[PDB]
mmCIF file of C-alpha atoms in Angstrom:
data_model
loop_
_atom_site.group_PDB
_atom_site.id
_atom_site.type_symbol
_atom_site.label_atom_id
_atom_site.label_comp_id
_atom_site.label_asym_id
_atom_site.label_seq_id
_atom_site.Cartn_x
_atom_site.Cartn_y
_atom_site.Cartn_z
ATOM 1 C CA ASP A 9 88.816 12.271 -43.481
ATOM 2 C CA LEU A 10 86.222 9.431 -43.854
ATOM 3 C CA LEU A 11 83.737 12.298 -43.465
ATOM 4 C CA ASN A 12 85.719 14.299 -46.893
ATOM 5 C CA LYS A 13 83.635 11.463 -48.776
ATOM 6 C CA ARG A 14 80.096 12.648 -46.384
ATOM 7 C CA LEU A 15 81.417 16.179 -47.004
ATOM 8 C CA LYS A 16 81.307 15.781 -50.968
ATOM 9 C CA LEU A 17 78.498 13.664 -51.234
ATOM 10 C CA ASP A 18 76.217 16.206 -49.840
ATOM 11 C CA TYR A 19 73.877 16.838 -52.150
ATOM 12 C CA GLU A 20 70.311 16.038 -53.376
ATOM 13 C CA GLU A 21 69.706 12.277 -55.403
ATOM 14 C CA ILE A 22 66.670 12.835 -58.130
ATOM 15 C CA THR A 23 65.649 9.180 -57.160
ATOM 16 C CA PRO A 24 67.373 7.709 -54.091
ATOM 17 C CA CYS A 25 69.009 4.199 -55.212
ATOM 18 C CA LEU A 26 67.094 1.788 -53.162
ATOM 19 C CA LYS A 27 68.133 -1.798 -51.121
ATOM 20 C CA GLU A 28 68.335 -4.086 -54.095
ATOM 21 C CA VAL A 29 70.416 -2.194 -56.809
ATOM 22 C CA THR A 30 72.839 -1.696 -54.393
ATOM 23 C CA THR A 31 73.257 -5.103 -53.813
ATOM 24 C CA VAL A 32 73.735 -5.748 -57.534
ATOM 25 C CA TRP A 33 76.650 -3.329 -57.923
ATOM 26 C CA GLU A 34 78.318 -4.712 -54.773
ATOM 27 C CA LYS A 35 78.927 -7.875 -56.362
ATOM 28 C CA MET A 36 80.229 -6.382 -60.079
ATOM 29 C CA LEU A 37 82.780 -4.069 -57.667
ATOM 30 C CA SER A 38 83.654 -6.912 -55.029
ATOM 31 C CA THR A 39 84.771 -9.303 -58.451
ATOM 32 C CA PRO A 40 88.574 -10.601 -58.362
ATOM 33 C CA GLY A 41 90.616 -9.775 -61.216
ATOM 34 C CA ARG A 42 87.289 -7.365 -61.698
ATOM 35 C CA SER A 43 89.370 -5.141 -64.188
ATOM 36 C CA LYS A 44 90.531 -7.689 -66.645
ATOM 37 C CA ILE A 45 86.819 -9.238 -67.011
ATOM 38 C CA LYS A 46 84.320 -7.999 -69.633
ATOM 39 C CA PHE A 47 80.502 -7.931 -68.127
ATOM 40 C CA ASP A 48 77.692 -8.398 -70.051
ATOM 41 C CA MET A 49 76.299 -5.005 -71.470
ATOM 42 C CA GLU A 50 72.391 -5.546 -70.678
ATOM 43 C CA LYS A 51 72.971 -6.190 -66.789
ATOM 44 C CA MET A 52 75.124 -3.234 -66.949
ATOM 45 C CA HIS A 53 72.970 -1.155 -68.562
ATOM 46 C CA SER A 54 70.004 -2.606 -66.364
ATOM 47 C CA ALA A 55 72.420 -1.291 -63.466
ATOM 48 C CA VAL A 56 73.159 1.885 -64.058
ATOM 49 C CA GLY A 57 69.261 2.438 -65.433
ATOM 50 C CA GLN A 58 67.941 1.201 -61.950
ATOM 51 C CA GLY A 59 70.311 3.736 -60.037
ATOM 52 C CA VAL A 60 73.822 4.225 -59.214
ATOM 53 C CA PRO A 61 74.248 4.375 -55.099
ATOM 54 C CA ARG A 62 75.837 7.807 -54.145
ATOM 55 C CA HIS A 63 78.112 5.983 -51.818
ATOM 56 C CA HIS A 64 79.964 3.818 -55.064
ATOM 57 C CA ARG A 65 79.346 6.451 -57.700
ATOM 58 C CA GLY A 66 83.094 6.485 -57.527
ATOM 59 C CA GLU A 67 83.808 3.093 -57.659
ATOM 60 C CA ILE A 68 80.887 2.620 -60.634
ATOM 61 C CA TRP A 69 82.600 5.026 -62.525
ATOM 62 C CA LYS A 70 86.110 3.825 -62.251
ATOM 63 C CA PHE A 71 84.036 0.288 -62.936
ATOM 64 C CA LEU A 72 82.495 1.327 -65.862
ATOM 65 C CA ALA A 73 85.892 3.044 -67.055
ATOM 66 C CA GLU A 74 87.973 -0.306 -67.020
ATOM 67 C CA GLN A 75 85.121 -1.905 -69.192
ATOM 68 C CA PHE A 76 85.561 0.735 -71.712
ATOM 69 C CA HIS A 77 89.105 0.298 -71.806
ATOM 70 C CA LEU A 78 88.240 -3.771 -72.246
ATOM 71 C CA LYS A 79 85.743 -3.105 -75.219
ATOM 72 C CA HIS A 80 87.727 -0.008 -76.857
ATOM 73 C CA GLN A 81 91.329 -0.843 -77.752
ATOM 74 C CA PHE A 82 92.398 2.603 -77.806
ATOM 75 C CA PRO A 83 95.879 2.528 -79.484
ATOM 76 C CA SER A 84 99.426 3.148 -79.156
ATOM 77 C CA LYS A 85 99.747 6.644 -81.397
ATOM 78 C CA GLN A 86 97.775 9.333 -79.165
ATOM 79 C CA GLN A 87 98.932 7.977 -75.865
ATOM 80 C CA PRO A 88 99.467 9.975 -72.982
ATOM 81 C CA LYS A 89 102.485 9.622 -71.154
ATOM 82 C CA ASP A 90 103.064 8.327 -67.260
ATOM 83 C CA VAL A 91 104.538 10.950 -65.761
ATOM 84 C CA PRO A 92 102.528 10.483 -62.145
ATOM 85 C CA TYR A 93 100.595 12.820 -60.873
ATOM 86 C CA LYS A 94 103.310 13.866 -58.184
ATOM 87 C CA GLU A 95 105.955 14.395 -60.649
ATOM 88 C CA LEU A 96 103.664 16.815 -63.015
ATOM 89 C CA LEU A 97 102.935 18.978 -59.669
ATOM 90 C CA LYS A 98 106.183 19.906 -58.999
ATOM 91 C CA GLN A 99 106.473 22.159 -62.255
ATOM 92 C CA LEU A 100 104.772 25.416 -62.781
ATOM 93 C CA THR A 101 102.147 25.605 -65.318
ATOM 94 C CA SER A 102 101.728 28.686 -66.916
ATOM 95 C CA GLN A 103 97.795 27.856 -66.695
ATOM 96 C CA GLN A 104 97.646 29.261 -63.567
ATOM 97 C CA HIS A 105 95.700 32.518 -63.562
ATOM 98 C CA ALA A 106 92.967 30.580 -66.006
ATOM 99 C CA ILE A 107 92.934 28.195 -63.687
ATOM 100 C CA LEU A 108 92.036 30.172 -60.622
ATOM 101 C CA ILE A 109 88.905 32.677 -62.139
ATOM 102 C CA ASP A 110 87.152 29.179 -62.975
ATOM 103 C CA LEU A 111 88.257 27.862 -59.316
ATOM 104 C CA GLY A 112 85.907 30.466 -57.790
ATOM 105 C CA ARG A 113 83.090 29.730 -59.789
ATOM 106 C CA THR A 114 82.871 26.083 -59.636
ATOM 107 C CA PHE A 115 80.208 25.043 -56.955
ATOM 108 C CA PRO A 116 80.399 27.467 -55.007
ATOM 109 C CA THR A 117 78.024 26.689 -52.419
ATOM 110 C CA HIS A 118 78.991 23.617 -52.321
ATOM 111 C CA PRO A 119 81.124 23.053 -48.232
ATOM 112 C CA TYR A 120 83.582 21.169 -50.252
ATOM 113 C CA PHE A 121 84.668 23.909 -52.222
ATOM 114 C CA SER A 122 82.875 26.812 -50.506
ATOM 115 C CA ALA A 123 86.524 28.161 -48.585
ATOM 116 C CA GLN A 124 88.219 29.961 -50.806
ATOM 117 C CA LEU A 125 92.064 27.575 -51.392
ATOM 118 C CA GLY A 126 90.268 25.309 -49.123
ATOM 119 C CA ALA A 127 91.315 21.843 -49.216
ATOM 120 C CA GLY A 128 88.405 21.116 -51.755
ATOM 121 C CA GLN A 129 89.748 23.782 -54.129
ATOM 122 C CA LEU A 130 93.791 23.220 -53.585
ATOM 123 C CA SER A 131 93.045 19.320 -54.604
ATOM 124 C CA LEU A 132 90.572 20.667 -57.380
ATOM 125 C CA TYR A 133 93.219 23.480 -58.384
ATOM 126 C CA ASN A 134 96.112 20.772 -58.669
ATOM 127 C CA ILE A 135 94.311 18.039 -60.527
ATOM 128 C CA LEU A 136 93.909 21.098 -63.077
ATOM 129 C CA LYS A 137 97.378 22.226 -62.574
ATOM 130 C CA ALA A 138 98.832 18.717 -63.403
ATOM 131 C CA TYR A 139 96.407 18.301 -65.980
ATOM 132 C CA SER A 140 97.548 21.288 -67.998
ATOM 133 C CA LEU A 141 101.219 20.433 -68.013
ATOM 134 C CA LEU A 142 100.239 16.992 -69.318
ATOM 135 C CA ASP A 143 98.163 18.194 -72.460
ATOM 136 C CA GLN A 144 99.635 21.359 -72.967
ATOM 137 C CA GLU A 145 97.725 21.721 -76.369
ATOM 138 C CA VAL A 146 94.282 22.052 -73.993
ATOM 139 C CA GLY A 147 95.909 23.310 -70.762
ATOM 140 C CA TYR A 148 93.669 24.685 -68.943
ATOM 141 C CA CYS A 149 89.643 25.516 -71.123
ATOM 142 C CA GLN A 150 87.433 27.339 -69.632
ATOM 143 C CA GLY A 151 84.287 24.826 -67.805
ATOM 144 C CA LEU A 152 86.821 21.911 -67.424
ATOM 145 C CA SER A 153 86.864 22.806 -63.653
ATOM 146 C CA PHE A 154 83.647 21.603 -63.309
ATOM 147 C CA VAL A 155 84.305 18.018 -64.792
ATOM 148 C CA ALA A 156 87.139 17.662 -62.797
ATOM 149 C CA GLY A 157 85.080 19.037 -59.971
ATOM 150 C CA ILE A 158 82.490 16.083 -60.264
ATOM 151 C CA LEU A 159 85.252 13.621 -60.311
ATOM 152 C CA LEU A 160 86.791 14.873 -57.588
ATOM 153 C CA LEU A 161 83.021 15.051 -55.761
ATOM 154 C CA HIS A 162 83.382 11.035 -55.868
ATOM 155 C CA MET A 163 86.797 9.403 -55.384
ATOM 156 C CA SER A 164 90.622 11.024 -54.352
ATOM 157 C CA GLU A 165 92.040 13.818 -55.463
ATOM 158 C CA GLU A 166 94.689 11.373 -57.415
ATOM 159 C CA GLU A 167 92.349 8.711 -58.649
ATOM 160 C CA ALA A 168 89.960 12.290 -59.801
ATOM 161 C CA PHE A 169 93.024 12.739 -61.884
ATOM 162 C CA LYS A 170 93.401 9.796 -63.918
ATOM 163 C CA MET A 171 89.873 9.705 -64.178
ATOM 164 C CA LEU A 172 90.025 13.096 -65.494
ATOM 165 C CA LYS A 173 93.312 11.413 -68.382
ATOM 166 C CA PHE A 174 90.829 8.673 -68.902
ATOM 167 C CA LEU A 175 87.383 10.785 -69.805
ATOM 168 C CA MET A 176 89.904 13.369 -71.465
ATOM 169 C CA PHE A 177 92.126 11.405 -73.765
ATOM 170 C CA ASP A 178 90.024 7.564 -73.647
ATOM 171 C CA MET A 179 87.188 8.892 -74.409
ATOM 172 C CA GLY A 180 88.145 12.062 -76.571
ATOM 173 C CA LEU A 181 86.533 14.665 -74.588
ATOM 174 C CA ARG A 182 89.747 16.699 -74.689
ATOM 175 C CA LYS A 183 88.763 17.283 -78.234
ATOM 176 C CA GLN A 184 85.655 20.117 -77.601
ATOM 177 C CA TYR A 185 88.393 21.802 -75.625
ATOM 178 C CA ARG A 186 91.357 22.902 -78.058
ATOM 179 C CA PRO A 187 91.980 26.072 -78.440
ATOM 180 C CA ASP A 188 90.540 26.866 -81.649
ATOM 181 C CA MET A 189 87.311 25.994 -80.439
ATOM 182 C CA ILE A 190 86.736 24.052 -83.667
ATOM 183 C CA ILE A 191 85.601 20.831 -82.529
ATOM 184 C CA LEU A 192 82.816 22.573 -80.270
ATOM 185 C CA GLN A 193 81.411 24.674 -83.449
ATOM 186 C CA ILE A 194 80.771 21.459 -85.100
ATOM 187 C CA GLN A 195 78.876 20.089 -82.161
ATOM 188 C CA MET A 196 77.019 23.202 -81.810
ATOM 189 C CA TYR A 197 76.433 22.725 -85.964
ATOM 190 C CA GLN A 198 75.451 18.864 -84.629
ATOM 191 C CA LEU A 199 73.132 19.800 -82.201
ATOM 192 C CA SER A 200 71.453 22.202 -84.504
ATOM 193 C CA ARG A 201 71.169 19.201 -87.105
ATOM 194 C CA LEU A 202 69.319 17.471 -84.318
ATOM 195 C CA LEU A 203 66.817 19.628 -83.917
ATOM 196 C CA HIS A 204 66.022 19.771 -87.095
ATOM 197 C CA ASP A 205 65.574 16.358 -87.433
ATOM 198 C CA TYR A 206 63.556 15.990 -84.555
ATOM 199 C CA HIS A 207 61.750 18.744 -83.459
ATOM 200 C CA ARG A 208 61.535 20.503 -86.325
ATOM 201 C CA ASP A 209 59.226 23.213 -85.076
ATOM 202 C CA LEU A 210 61.665 23.932 -82.342
ATOM 203 C CA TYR A 211 64.071 24.088 -84.961
ATOM 204 C CA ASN A 212 62.037 26.548 -87.121
ATOM 205 C CA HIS A 213 61.312 28.604 -83.901
ATOM 206 C CA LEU A 214 64.953 28.710 -82.879
ATOM 207 C CA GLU A 215 65.850 29.976 -86.343
ATOM 208 C CA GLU A 216 63.367 31.997 -87.004
ATOM 209 C CA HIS A 217 64.810 34.463 -84.139
ATOM 210 C CA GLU A 218 68.639 33.365 -84.793
ATOM 211 C CA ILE A 219 68.963 31.520 -82.000
ATOM 212 C CA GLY A 220 72.205 29.106 -82.846
ATOM 213 C CA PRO A 221 73.280 26.621 -80.450
ATOM 214 C CA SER A 222 76.318 28.814 -79.297
ATOM 215 C CA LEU A 223 73.613 31.326 -77.720
ATOM 216 C CA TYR A 224 73.055 28.699 -75.011
ATOM 217 C CA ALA A 225 74.813 25.183 -75.553
ATOM 218 C CA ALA A 226 78.316 26.521 -74.852
ATOM 219 C CA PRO A 227 78.162 25.912 -70.814
ATOM 220 C CA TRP A 228 76.247 22.134 -71.648
ATOM 221 C CA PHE A 229 79.188 20.835 -73.427
ATOM 222 C CA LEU A 230 81.596 22.425 -71.917
ATOM 223 C CA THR A 231 80.941 21.769 -67.908
ATOM 224 C CA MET A 232 78.883 18.769 -68.908
ATOM 225 C CA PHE A 233 75.720 20.226 -67.417
ATOM 226 C CA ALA A 234 77.270 20.978 -64.432
ATOM 227 C CA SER A 235 77.383 24.894 -63.837
ATOM 228 C CA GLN A 236 73.614 25.107 -64.460
ATOM 229 C CA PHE A 237 72.109 22.059 -63.363
ATOM 230 C CA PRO A 238 71.448 20.254 -60.296
ATOM 231 C CA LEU A 239 74.565 18.150 -58.908
ATOM 232 C CA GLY A 240 72.184 15.115 -58.613
ATOM 233 C CA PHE A 241 71.233 15.765 -62.144
ATOM 234 C CA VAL A 242 74.919 15.785 -63.623
ATOM 235 C CA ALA A 243 75.798 12.936 -61.346
ATOM 236 C CA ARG A 244 73.218 10.720 -63.169
ATOM 237 C CA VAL A 245 74.470 12.395 -66.293
ATOM 238 C CA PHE A 246 77.816 11.183 -65.331
ATOM 239 C CA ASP A 247 76.903 7.880 -64.965
ATOM 240 C CA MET A 248 75.339 7.573 -68.670
ATOM 241 C CA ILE A 249 78.490 8.958 -70.018
ATOM 242 C CA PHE A 250 80.592 6.571 -68.355
ATOM 243 C CA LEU A 251 78.456 3.434 -70.051
ATOM 244 C CA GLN A 252 77.701 5.050 -72.698
ATOM 245 C CA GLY A 253 80.297 8.088 -74.020
ATOM 246 C CA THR A 254 80.302 11.384 -74.238
ATOM 247 C CA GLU A 255 77.725 12.195 -76.833
ATOM 248 C CA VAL A 256 75.177 11.892 -73.490
ATOM 249 C CA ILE A 257 75.828 15.275 -73.610
ATOM 250 C CA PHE A 258 73.766 15.198 -77.180
ATOM 251 C CA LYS A 259 71.139 13.132 -75.880
ATOM 252 C CA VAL A 260 70.831 15.227 -72.768
ATOM 253 C CA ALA A 261 70.646 18.811 -74.781
ATOM 254 C CA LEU A 262 67.914 17.012 -77.336
ATOM 255 C CA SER A 263 65.804 15.611 -74.733
ATOM 256 C CA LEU A 264 65.949 19.059 -72.658
ATOM 257 C CA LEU A 265 65.299 21.104 -75.846
ATOM 258 C CA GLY A 266 62.483 18.577 -76.636
ATOM 259 C CA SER A 267 60.940 18.691 -73.382
ATOM 260 C CA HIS A 268 61.017 22.187 -72.934
ATOM 261 C CA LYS A 269 59.732 23.088 -76.662
ATOM 262 C CA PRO A 270 55.887 24.498 -75.380
ATOM 263 C CA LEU A 271 57.429 26.589 -73.171
ATOM 264 C CA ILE A 272 59.686 27.551 -75.618
ATOM 265 C CA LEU A 273 57.581 28.836 -78.274
ATOM 266 C CA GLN A 274 55.635 30.981 -76.319
ATOM 267 C CA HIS A 275 58.704 33.200 -76.348
ATOM 268 C CA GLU A 276 58.770 35.443 -79.155
ATOM 269 C CA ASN A 277 62.124 37.549 -79.436
ATOM 270 C CA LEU A 278 66.100 36.159 -79.185
ATOM 271 C CA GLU A 279 66.231 38.436 -75.191
ATOM 272 C CA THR A 280 62.800 35.971 -74.220
ATOM 273 C CA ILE A 281 64.219 32.752 -75.655
ATOM 274 C CA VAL A 282 67.660 32.898 -74.373
ATOM 275 C CA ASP A 283 66.760 33.763 -71.155
ATOM 276 C CA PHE A 284 64.253 30.568 -70.508
ATOM 277 C CA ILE A 285 67.100 28.186 -71.738
ATOM 278 C CA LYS A 286 69.869 29.890 -69.774
ATOM 279 C CA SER A 287 68.227 30.650 -66.498
ATOM 280 C CA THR A 288 64.360 28.932 -66.461
ATOM 281 C CA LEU A 289 65.035 25.867 -68.414
ATOM 282 C CA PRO A 290 67.777 24.667 -65.543
ATOM 283 C CA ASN A 291 64.885 24.915 -62.826
ATOM 284 C CA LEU A 292 63.738 21.632 -63.330
ATOM 285 C CA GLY A 293 61.617 19.344 -61.001
ATOM 286 C CA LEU A 294 62.495 16.076 -59.675
ATOM 287 C CA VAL A 295 59.854 14.259 -61.954
ATOM 288 C CA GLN A 296 61.284 15.857 -64.980
ATOM 289 C CA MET A 297 64.941 14.821 -64.482
ATOM 290 C CA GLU A 298 63.868 11.260 -63.608
ATOM 291 C CA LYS A 299 61.927 11.678 -67.134
ATOM 292 C CA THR A 300 64.955 13.461 -68.628
ATOM 293 C CA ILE A 301 67.448 10.822 -67.773
ATOM 294 C CA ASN A 302 65.481 7.764 -68.373
ATOM 295 C CA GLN A 303 64.670 9.190 -72.391
ATOM 296 C CA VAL A 304 68.216 10.086 -72.836
ATOM 297 C CA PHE A 305 69.123 6.705 -71.775
ATOM 298 C CA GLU A 306 67.315 4.465 -74.214
ATOM 299 C CA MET A 307 68.160 7.181 -76.540
ATOM 300 C CA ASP A 308 70.348 6.337 -79.789
ATOM 301 C CA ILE A 309 71.478 8.938 -82.412
ATOM 302 C CA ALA A 310 75.599 7.898 -82.963
ATOM 303 C CA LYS A 311 74.890 7.549 -86.535
ATOM 304 C CA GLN A 312 73.427 11.202 -86.840
ATOM 305 C CA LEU A 313 76.026 12.677 -85.060
ATOM 306 C CA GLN A 314 77.959 10.861 -87.614
ATOM 307 C CA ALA A 315 76.145 11.775 -90.284
ATOM 308 C CA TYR A 316 76.084 15.653 -89.462
ATOM 309 C CA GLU A 317 79.681 15.517 -88.929
ATOM 310 C CA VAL A 318 80.516 14.717 -92.254
ATOM 311 C CA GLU A 319 78.006 17.232 -93.180
ATOM 312 C CA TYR A 320 79.771 19.749 -91.784
ATOM 313 C CA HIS A 321 82.721 19.580 -93.940
ATOM 314 C CA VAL A 322 80.960 19.208 -96.938
ATOM 315 C CA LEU A 323 79.357 22.146 -96.665
ATOM 316 C CA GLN A 324 82.816 23.968 -95.584
ATOM 317 C CA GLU A 325 84.269 23.770 -98.733
#
């Protein structure tokens, strides 16, 4: 019952948010008719940057989504339909097997998900089942359980489904999850170009050993870092995603790669380089995570990403 929130929110923070900013959030959250009011971008940006209290993370994300709605029309051709959560769950989904195989690997040591087909896992299962029936083109795609999982850890089951719909449709995250993997391939290309333009030396080193992003970045995009990084770090990455968009993933990837460049440069073969990026890099210390979040947060690469996309299509022909 309210122990569920306790059960769910039991994870180490990178930097505990202090007294004062908890104060500022409560005021924005308590605003009457909140969803219809546009808040000033800079206050929010300062708010997110100064800390997101764990006890309010979920409501904050929903608040940030309301703000996203107000700033982005987000049109009437690609909507998603409104068969309620409870109604979708009456049906059977063809994605049952795919959901189950990932379910067992989703935050397996977290007390809320440790019990096989326990309350936590069932709620997650149902969210994914519903989503697969809503978005049958995507159905269930590997890694999605971590995303739905992180949402579930900060709000109710049905609230998590709604936010998942919002993140996937309104924020466009669903694109990378389509079965053809085309958008995922373009994202791999974009990260590579990002490395070329911002850390040429790292780029040259990776190219020399033929290490394309697909050898290590797939989990970063598809699980949004949730499958390999600490929960506290991933939760801050999500704070930023809801405020600044899914492109934050690229920012975090670039920041991490750039940050560990000196170490990656010391490895001389595909086996050692990939192993470092896959297994060692995720073992970041508290200060490192702190620096990463702050750097990523002020990073601006939207125009470059856009350009790399056009570039991809020109080279395809």
